[PDB]
Amino acid sequence: GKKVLIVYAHQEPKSFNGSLKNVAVDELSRQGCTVTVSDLYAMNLEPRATDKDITGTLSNPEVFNYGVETHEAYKQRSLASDITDEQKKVREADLVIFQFPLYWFSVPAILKGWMDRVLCQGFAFDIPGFYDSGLLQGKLALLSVTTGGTAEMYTKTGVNGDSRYFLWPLQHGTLHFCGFKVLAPQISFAPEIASEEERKGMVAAWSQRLQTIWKEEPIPCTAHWHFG
Amino acid sequence: GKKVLIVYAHQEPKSFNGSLKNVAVDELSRQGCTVTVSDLYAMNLEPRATDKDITGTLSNPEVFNYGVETHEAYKQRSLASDITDEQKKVREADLVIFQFPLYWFSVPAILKGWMDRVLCQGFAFDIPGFYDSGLLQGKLALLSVTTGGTAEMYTKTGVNGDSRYFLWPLQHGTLHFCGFKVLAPQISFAPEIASEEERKGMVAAWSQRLQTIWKEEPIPCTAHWHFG
Ligand SMILES: Cc1cc2nc3c(=O)[nH]c(=O)nc-3n(C[C@H](O)[C@H](O)[C@H](O)COP(=O)(O)OP(=O)(O)OC[C@H]3O[C@@H](n4cnc5c(N)ncnc54)[C@H](O)[C@@H]3O)c2cc1C
Ligand SMILES: Cc1cc2nc3c(=O)[nH]c(=O)nc-3n(C[C@H](O)[C@H](O)[C@H](O)COP(=O)(O)OP(=O)(O)OC[C@H]3O[C@@H](n4cnc5c(N)ncnc54)[C@H](O)[C@@H]3O)c2cc1C
Ligand SMILES: CCOCc1nc2c(N)nc3ccccc3c2[nH]1
Ligand SMILES: CCOCc1nc2c(N)nc3ccccc3c2[nH]1
Ligand SMILES: CCOCc1nc2c(N)nc3ccccc3c2[nH]1
Ligand SMILES: CCOCc1nc2c(N)nc3ccccc3c2[nH]1
Ligand SMILES: [Zn+2]
Ligand SMILES: [Zn+2]
């Protein structure tokens, strides 16, 4: 009995992202998986890292250091309930899927805020306690990304460079850092300019992959994998 | 007579980031430059890309497309005043400095929100009108970033990889994409770990650099610069 968390960052349910989220819920639900979706825009998730994220007495209330105070708050069980609720979902999940459109070679800010605020020290990593020793070891993560740019644009000789170049901060710097094993990304290139037929194929391809997702091995989340 | 915008993303004015911000304002003010600072946390800048960013009625209110609607809103002069206020500051600036702590190999979410919402189609880029032909072409941009990790950890052979790897989505995918010429990053490594005197050295180096900032050549913002 596998538990999946989908962290979803799109404003419109009828979007191509909305369709990819829905196809994931349907397929994983049909398999008998336990599925939870954090729909960040519908939640109006707070993206800003502020002192409101700590509900206890600050370690140093004169000079506010977000990393220090959230770490201490996590240990004192005194983080904001929105953070606490996301952490519970992550803690229960065997797989965390991130579904989002690429914004400036990265995640939309609302999803960046999820990362910034949820993956706090003591919960997702410690020092020491990162990369292969990260605290979310034993979990899988998968980026399901849609782009404006075509696949040709995301090659070493295209204007945007290899897609693996933009994956590094997310897959390695964030997910691997917290101990996740990373499944190969699902990149759906340029749905806005693809044909109706081609769009259905990309949605179908995602649905089909998910049928066998539990038998995939993660990528080796290495510099070598990303950069050759 | 040069104009500088500092986009600043730190919660605490007594922080090392706060100090680097103040040194920049002091030095550029002393030179006679026109200086403006967008203090994103003090402004409580909205980071989420939503339909509240378009004033009045939408192009397609049935199916919301953030990209399409903000492009149209830019042409119709119906973007939210927080966005248009930032665009005015960027339009006038000859140099834009971003001052921030590294969050998950990237910018803090509030600054990511600035990038997502301010740099809209029609203002920062168009088709055609990207990379060297971006709509902000000729302007200079500079990332002044502080890290938790030390310089020796941000090497090709270290666990984190070269610091240049994480600069790619920001310098290339964002700044170069909009036509900015990118000055070399100012990376202030591990101020929390560094000695008092080391920190003073890092502040003094930034102050020194700013004295001759207008004499600098930009970097070749290429895949080879970042990964070669
Ligand atoms: C602020 C910002 C920054 C950006 N930065 C970047 C960047 O750095 N790099 C980059 O490449 N791109 C970038 N983009 C572009 C962005 O990544 C794309 O616009 C996005 O990925 C498109 O996904 P979508 O779900 O919005 O597409 P949609 O517009 O929702 O999808 C296109 C069409 O597919 C249709 N569709 C939906 N479901 C289905 C289905 N089941 N079957 C068939 N058709 C369907 C929809 O009706 C729609 O008409 C950026 C966009 C913004 C707003
Ligand atoms: C959500 C999150 C994600 C992060 N992700 C990453 C990551 O991916 N990679 C990474 O490397 N790091 C990461 N970090 C760590 C973060 O980058 C550092 O904590 C940050 O850059 C430190 O900068 P600061 O300004 O907060 O330092 P501060 O703690 O404000 O400064 C350190 C010391 O400098 C002192 N100081 C201030 N001004 C001066 C002055 N003029 N002269 C001398 N001393 C002075 C202060 O008093 C303080 O003692 C992350 C942190 C968070 C919260
Ligand atoms: C009345 C039908 O409205 C469109 C819709 N289709 C789906 C779906 N296949 N799957 C879904 C899974 C989770 C949440 C929503 C959906 C969904 N919504
Ligand atoms: C026979 C109808 O086939 C299409 C289909 N629609 C949905 C749906 N709205 N929601 C679903 C939720 C869970 C699992 C499957 C679906 C689903 N399947
Ligand atoms: C025409 C409607 O606009 C969609 C779009 N926005 C972006 C962007 N900021 N950046 C991009 C970078 C590379 C390729 C495509 C994009 C892109 N596409
Ligand atoms: C220690 C291993 O590599 C460098 C590094 N230092 C920090 C830090 N002080 N704090 C962090 C907070 C969140 C995410 C990463 C870091 C981080 N990364
Ligand atoms: Zn890795
Ligand atoms: Zn470039």
Per-domain residue ranges of chain A: 1-228
Which residue from B50, B106, B119 is facing A169, i.e. has the nearest CB? B106
Compute φ and ψ for A111, nearest 5 degrees.
Answer: -75, -35
Residues 6+ apart with CB under 8 A from B205: none
Which residue from B44, B63, B174 is facing A105, i.e. has the nearest CB? B174
What separation in Å is there between the alpha carbon of A22 and the centre of ligand 3?
A: 6
Nearest to B4 by CA among B23, B16, B208, B217: B23
Task: Write down the residue that tokens 């460079």 correspond to.
Answer: A161
Q: How far apart are CA A97 and CA A210, in angstroms?
A: 11
Q: Which two tokens stand for residue A149?
A: 């740019």
Minimal Cα–Cα distance from B107 to chain A, Å? 9
Asked whether the beta carbons of B143 and B9 are under 8 A apart, the reply is no
> Looking at the CA of A224, which ligand is closest?
7
Nearest to A166 by CA among A104, A117, A110: A104
How determined? X-ray
- Contact between chains at A112 and B105 (C-beta distance less than 8 A): no
The Cα-based distances of A141 to A4, A168, A226, B100 in angstroms read 10, 14, 16, 27
Task: Write down the residue that tokens 């971003």 correspond to.
Answer: B98
Residues 6+ apart with CB under 8 A from A60: A68, A69
> Looking at the CA of A21, which ligand is closest?
3
Residues 6+ apart with CB under 8 A from B149: B160, B189, B190
Residue of A26, A27, A37 best suited for mutating to test ligand 4, as the one with most atoms within 8 Å of CB: A26
Q: How far apart are CA A166 and CA B223, in angstroms?
A: 11
What separation in Å is there between the alpha carbon of B188 and the centre of ligand 5?
A: 31
Residue of B15, B16, B100, B160 best suited for mutating to test ligand 6, as the one with most atoms within 8 Å of CB: B160
Atom 7 of ligand 6, residue of closest alpha carbon: B148
Q: How far apart are CA B190 and CA B193, in angstroms?
A: 5
State the Cα angle at B8 between B7 and B12, rounded to 5°: 165
Is any atom of ligand 5 closer than 6 Å to the C-beta of A148? yes
Q: How far apart are CA B72 and CA B190, in angstroms?
A: 43
Asked whether the beta carbons of B176 and B134 are under 8 A apart, the reply is yes
> Looking at the CA of B18, which ligand is closest?
2
- In chain B, how long is the greatest CA-to-CA distance? 59
Q: What number of H helices and E strands is found in chain A?
A: 8, 6
Task: Write down the residue that tokens 């902000």 correspond to.
Answer: B136
Q: Which residues of A are annotated as a binding site for FAD?
A: 10, 16-19, 102-105, 146-149, 154, 192, 199
Nearest to A131 by CA among A85, A172, A76: A172
Asked whether the beta carbons of B226 and B163 are under 8 A apart, the reply is no
8-state DSSP, B174: I
> Does the N-terminal peptide bond of residue A13 adopt cis geometry, omega within 30 degrees of 0?
no
Compute φ and ψ for B45, nearest 5 degrees.
Answer: -55, 130
What separation in Å is there between the alpha carbon of A150 and the centre of ligand 1?
A: 11
* DSSP notation for B51-79: GGGB-S--S-SSS--HHHHHHHHHHTT-B
What separation in Å is there between the alpha carbon of B183 and the centre of ligand 8?
A: 11
Q: What is the dihedral of CA A186, A192, A195, A201, to 10 degrees?
A: 20
Atom 7 of ligand 5, residue of closest alpha carbon: A148
Q: Does domain A1-228 have CATH number 3.40.50.360?
A: yes
